């Protein structure tokens, strides 16, 4: 939900109630929720350097928006009952997003304010970069494992032409310890099963007679084998390829499919056993990421208020929830309530006569 964050010069200490609800300066006559913002005591540090510091702070805030949006889109890419609007109810560090936003509170233990706010912004940037890189690494590894799992899933996909025979065929249909007998699985459809099974000597000579024995049946064609001399396989394939007889020289071994299936199951299980930790990691990381997001927004509000008011740091910051589709009426009201602050000059655009920021879902 879309929240405004407005600051005022604070010429009067009764403005705390004005932030709270006060009717004489309320929004749509108490139809919109107004709330006081947490105003701590933070030093100034610099003014002439602070202009460039604020510009770089805005650039860092844009980068913060990019990285947190990437965190959100990967959270939606989590999947497994946690796709997009599924779990649209995400949690701001264990509480509701709305709950934290409306109950914003600041703590110094994250960053001692006795240090330069430039140092603090750089440390937040370092932490943000570190978690961004952690997200990149985790996403890359998990996507590679997902690709491996999907490849193994597609290994069970395709016709006899484009897929193996792991769970259809047995070892004993093939000649065992042969001298020169090569057993070829020539897939034959039911459209030509009788032709293959009764014209096999006419297909090629030098073949084992009466080896026209059916193996199994799949959903579109039938499966069978031809046992014949090694060179005669060439002639058999050459004549058979033009009578709807597909050639598939399937090789069987216990390991050749058992190991692949066992690895597929193991990879799936390990992907799930990392999926759990992935949910926990994303939760705990996005907690602090979004906390620091609001924190850097608040720092931007603070520095802008100090720059744009005067020597004392006595400003009145406040969160606000404009009533739906009455933003125009509140625009009129707030223009009337904020033009008088200067009364000399202040087109608004982003250059309002007041200090404003936004935050939304």
């Amino acid at each position: 939900t879309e929240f405004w964050l407005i600051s005022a010069p604070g010429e009067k200490t009764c403005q705390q109630t004005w932030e709270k609800l006060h009717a004489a300066t309320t929004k749509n006559n108490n139809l919109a929720v107004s709330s006081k913002f947490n105003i701590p005591d933070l030093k100034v540090g610099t003014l002439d350097v602070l202009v460039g510091l604020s510009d770089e702070l805005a650039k860092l805030d844009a980068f913060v928006e990019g990285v947190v949006k990437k965190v959100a889109q990967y959270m939606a890419d989590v999947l497994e009952d946690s796709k997009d609007k599924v779990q649209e109810n995400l949690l701001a560090s264990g509480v509701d997003l709305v709950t934290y936003i409306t109950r914003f509170q600041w703590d110094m233990a994250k960053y001692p304010i006795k240090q330069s706010l430039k140092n603090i912004s750089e440390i937040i940037a370092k932490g943000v970069t570190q978690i961004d890189n952690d997200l990149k690494s985790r996403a890359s590894a998990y996507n590679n494992l997902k690709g491996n799992l999907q490849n193994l899933e597609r290994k069970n996909a395709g016709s006899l032409l484009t897929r193996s025979l792991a769970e259809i065929v047995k070892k004993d249909d093939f000649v065992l310890d042969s001298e020169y007998l090569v057993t070829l699985l020539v897939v034959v459809p039911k459209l030509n099963h009788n032709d293959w099974i009764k014209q096999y000597e006419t297909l090629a000579e030098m073949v084992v007679p009466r080896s026209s024995n059916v193996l199994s049946e799949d959903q579109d064609s039938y499966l069978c084998n031809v046992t014949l001399f090694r060179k005669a396989v060439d002639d058999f394939r050459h004549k058979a390829r033009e009578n709807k007889f597909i050639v598939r020289d399937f090789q069987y071994n216990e390991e050749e499919m058992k190991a692949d299936k066992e690895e597929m199951t193991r990879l799936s299980t390990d992907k799930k056993k990392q999926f759990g930790p992935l949910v926990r990691w994303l939760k705990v990381n996005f907690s602090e990421a979004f906390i620091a997001w609001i924190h850097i927004k608040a720092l931007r509000v603070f520095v802008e208020s100090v720059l744009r008011y005067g020597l004392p740091v006595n400003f009145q910051a406040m969160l606000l929830q404009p009533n739906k589709k009455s933003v125009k009426k509140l625009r009129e009201v707030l223009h009337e309530l904020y033009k008088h602050l200067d009364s000399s000059a202040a087109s608004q655009q982003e250059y309002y006569p007041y200090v404003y920021y936004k935050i939304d879902c």
Binding site: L311, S343, A345
Partner: protein, 56 residues
């Protein structure tokens, strides 16, 4: 967006934060004075200690 006196108010803003900058520079200069005192006193004490030890 300033009146005929608010321009002077913001001139005073720059002036008084320059006062705070001067105070902070003075405090850091006293810090440098303490640190310079420490290192130079230690170095001089070291040299005089060396001379007395060799003489003794």
């Amino acid at each position: 967006a300033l009146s005929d006196a608010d321009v002077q108010k913001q001139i005073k803003h720059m002036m008084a934060f320059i006062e705070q900058e001067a105070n902070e520079k003075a405090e850091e200069i006293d810090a440098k004075a303490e640190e310079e005192f420490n290192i130079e006193k230690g170095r001089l004490v070291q040299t005089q200690r060396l001379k007395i030890m060799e003489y003794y």
